[PDB]
Amino acid sequence: IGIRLTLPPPKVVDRWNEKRAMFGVYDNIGILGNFEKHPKELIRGPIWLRGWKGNELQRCIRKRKMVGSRMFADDLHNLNKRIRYLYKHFNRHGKFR
Amino acid sequence: LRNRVTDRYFRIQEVLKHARHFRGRKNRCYRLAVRTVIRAF
């Protein structure tokens, strides 16, 4: 019980597919490109996370600020509630003061 | 990334191999065997 009785299908990884072959290209776009573009501009993803880092509380505050007006009702309610829960946790609870 | 223990079977067998010659359920039930095996050691 709890362990498979047959080997799983072999893992086939094409290490020289185009995505892997060209990984990292243009990561020095600024240093080698007269600084016309910052490498952070190559980052693709959520509009509130491109070229920025923060803890979960900071991410939540940032998302509500940047896209809260476009969020679905149920989603925004949960986000507001998450911000409240994290505010109490980080500011009031923990080992250290 | 969700990680789950995949080799728990072998971890259990490390204890139970020492409890095969025990009497009763403590020779097969890990919860019981582990305590008796420690005492044996």
Partner: peptide, 26 residues
Amino acid sequence: VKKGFRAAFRFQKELERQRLLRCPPP
């Protein structure tokens, strides 16, 4: 179904040891 190959491979080796013990080869 759990992810991974190492545990499954290890269990195969044990299943092959037990099979041989049940029927020791000539």
